[PDB]
Design a protein around this ligand. Sequence first.
Ligand SMILES: OC[C@H]1O[C@@H](O[C@@H]2[C@@H](O)[C@H](O[C@@H]3[C@@H](O)[C@H](O[C@@H]4[C@@H](O)[C@H](O[C@@H]5[C@@H](O)[C@H](O[C@@H]6[C@@H](O)[C@H](O)O[C@H](CO)[C@H]6O)O[C@H](CO)[C@H]5O)O[C@H](CO)[C@H]4O)O[C@H](CO)[C@H]3O)O[C@H](CO)[C@H]2O)[C@H](O)[C@@H](O)[C@@H]1O
Ligand SMILES: OC[C@H]1O[C@@H](O[C@@H]2[C@@H](O)[C@H](O[C@@H]3[C@@H](O)[C@H](O[C@@H]4[C@@H](O)[C@H](O[C@@H]5[C@@H](O)[C@H](O)O[C@H](CO)[C@H]5O)O[C@H](CO)[C@H]4O)O[C@H](CO)[C@H]3O)O[C@H](CO)[C@H]2O)[C@H](O)[C@@H](O)[C@@H]1O
Length: 549
Amino acid sequence: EVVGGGDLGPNVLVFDPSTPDIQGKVDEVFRKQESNQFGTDRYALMFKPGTYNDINAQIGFYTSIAGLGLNPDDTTFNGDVTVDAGWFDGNATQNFWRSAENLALNPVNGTNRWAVSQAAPFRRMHVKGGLNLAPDGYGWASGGYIADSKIDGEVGPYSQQQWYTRDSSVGGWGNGVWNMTFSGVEGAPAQSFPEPPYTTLETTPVSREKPFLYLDGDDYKVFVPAKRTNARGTSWGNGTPEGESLPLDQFYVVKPGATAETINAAVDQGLHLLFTPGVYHVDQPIEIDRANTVALGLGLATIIPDNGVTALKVGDVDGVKVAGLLVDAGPVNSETLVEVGSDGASGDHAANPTSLQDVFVRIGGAGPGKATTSIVVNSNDTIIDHTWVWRADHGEGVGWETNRADYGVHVKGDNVLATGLFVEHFNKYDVQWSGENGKTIFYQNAKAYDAPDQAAIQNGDIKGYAAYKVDDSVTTHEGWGMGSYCYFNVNPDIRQQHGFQAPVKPGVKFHDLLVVSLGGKGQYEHVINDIGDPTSGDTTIPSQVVSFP
Ligand SMILES: OC[C@H]1O[C@@H](O[C@@H]2[C@@H](O)[C@H](O[C@@H]3[C@@H](O)[C@H](O[C@@H]4[C@@H](O)[C@H](O[C@@H]5[C@@H](O)[C@H](O[C@@H]6[C@@H](O)[C@H](O)O[C@H](CO)[C@H]6O)O[C@H](CO)[C@H]5O)O[C@H](CO)[C@H]4O)O[C@H](CO)[C@H]3O)O[C@H](CO)[C@H]2O)[C@H](O)[C@@H](O)[C@@H]1O
Ligand SMILES: OC[C@H]1O[C@@H](O[C@@H]2[C@@H](O)[C@H](O[C@@H]3[C@@H](O)[C@H](O[C@@H]4[C@@H](O)[C@H](O[C@@H]5[C@@H](O)[C@H](O)O[C@H](CO)[C@H]5O)O[C@H](CO)[C@H]4O)O[C@H](CO)[C@H]3O)O[C@H](CO)[C@H]2O)[C@H](O)[C@@H](O)[C@@H]1O
C-alpha cells in the first residue's frame, strides 16, 4: 500500500521570524547555488507568516522562495528577494530555474531586482515599490514571467529582450526592447507595437492560478485556485480567493528514492503528489489518471526518465494540475517526455481543464540527453501557463547529433491555450499545432545554434523548420506577441526561411510577430511564410509583421 503526508525532508527549509541567523542561512544556500547551473542540488526556502527584517535573499540556481500565508502580505520582507548576474559578469542570460511566490517585499532602496531569464517565475507577489528586471550594469537578459502580482511602483525591464505579464497590476512600465506582452494587466500600457514593442490584451481568456503550499496554523495545506475566465488584475487583491484547501495528509510526499510504481500506487489510491526538492530517476512513466489530481513540485524538483521511457503521462480526465517540475531527458532517447491525454483525445474539459504550470523541460546540458518530442498535448481545453522547453545550447552533452531533439511541443487537442510559451533550439519544429482554435499569448524562441550547414535543416523546398507551425488543414488559430531569434554560430552563412508557418485562412490570425538575427550569425529570409522583410546587417534589428494574413 502507501501513506499520506510525512517529512518535507532536509531540502525544504522552513523559517520563521526567529530562526537565528537568516541572512547567513540564505547566504550559504546562494554560495553553493549561485554558479551551480547543472548540479543536482535542489532547495525550497519557505517562510512562515510574519514580518522579516534586514533580509536580502539572493536566489541562485534551483532555489524556490515563498511565503506560507494564504495571502502574499501575510509574509512580508523588509528587504529583498534578489537575482543579479555577478557570477556571469552582468550577463543575466543563464539565470535560469528559480522562483519566487506568495510574498510581500518592501525593498531596501525602494526597488527589488529580479534579473532573470527563462524558467524563473514571479507569482503571487506584492512589491511595495519598483521592480527592476535588469542586472546591475544593465547587460544582457532574456526573461521572463510575472503572474498574479501587484507591483506598487514601476516595472523597469531596461535590457530585457522580452517579457510576459499576466493578470497583475503595475504602478508603471519602463520600456520595451523586442516583445513585451501583457494580458489582464492593470497599469499595462496600451497596445502600440512596434513602437514601443507592447502587445496588450485587456483580459486573459482563461487562467487558473498555480497551486501552492501554505500554513493553516500548524497545519500544512495546498491551496488550489479555481478557473477565472476573462481574467484581469490579481486573484487575491480584494481578498480571500476562490479555491479548495487540501491537507498535506492527502498528498503523497515524494522523496528521492520513491519509484514510479509507488508514486503511481499513491495516485491510483487517490493521493495527490508533492515532490520535495530533489532529482527523481524513474524507469516507468509517472501516470496521472484521476481527475483533479494535483502534482506539485517544490525547489525545482526534477524527473529524469531512464531507459527511454516517457516521464509523465496524464490521462483523459478533468482538472489535473501539474506545477513546478523540471523534466530532464536521459541519455537514452525518449519518444516523448510529457504527454497530456491519449493518442486521439476526443472529449472535452471546458469547465475543469488540465494544466501545466512552471513545467520546464531540458534536453542535455548536464550530460547527454535526447528525446524525439518533448511535450505532446492531446487533451482538449488544456492550459499551458508558463513553460520553457529547452534543448540545451551549452553545458555538457550537447551537440547537433549528441543532444538531438527534433520537436519541442506538439499541440493536437482543440481549444488549447498557451500563455507564456518559451521553446528553444530544437533540430526541427520547436512548436507544431494541429488542433483547432488554439491560442498563444506570448512566444519566445531561439533556433538551434549548432546546425552545421544549410542541408542539415532542409524542410523540403524550405530552408529551416519554423519555430512555430500551424498545420495547413487548421481552420481557427490565434497568436499574440511572438518572436523567434537565430544565432547560427557554427555556420553563420545559414539562412532560416521564416520564424512562423501557417495556412492562409481568415480564421488563422497572428498579431505582433518578429524575427531577429543575433549579431549577424545567420539571417531570416522572412518573418512568416514568405512574408515580412528578411533580417539584414549584424546590428540586431528585428523584422516585424503586425497583422496576418
Ligand atoms: O547564453 C545562452 C543562452 O542564450 C540565449 O540567447 C542569447 C541571447 O539572449 C543574446 O541576445 C543578445 C541581446 O540580449 C542583446 O540585446 C540588446 C539589449 O541588451 C539592449 O538593452 C538596452 C540597454 O542596454 C540600455 O541600457 C541603458 C544604458 O544604456 C544606460 O547607461 O542607462 C540606462 C538607464 O538609465 C539603460 O536603460 O537600455 C535600453 C533601453 O533604454 C536597452 O534597449 O538593447 C539592444 C537593442 O536596443 C538589444 O539588442 O543584444 C545582443 C547583441 O547586440 C544579443 O546578442 O544573444 C546571445 C548570443 O551571443 C544568445 O546566446 C538563449 O535564449 C538561451 O536559451 C541560451 O541558453
Ligand atoms: O543592499 C541591497 C541591494 O543588494 C543588491 O544585491 C547585491 C548584488 O546586486 C551584487 O551583485 C554584484 C553584481 O551587481 C556585480 O555585477 C557587475 C556589475 O555591478 C557592473 O555594473 C556596473 C555598474 O554598477 C556601473 O554603474 O556601471 C558599469 C558600467 O557602466 C557597470 O559595469 O557590471 C559588471 C560587469 O561589467 C558586473 O560584473 O558583480 C558582483 C560580483 O560577482 C556582484 O556582487 O552582489 C551583492 C553581494 O552581496 C548583493 O548584495 C540588489 O541587487 C539590490 O537591488 C539591492 O538594493
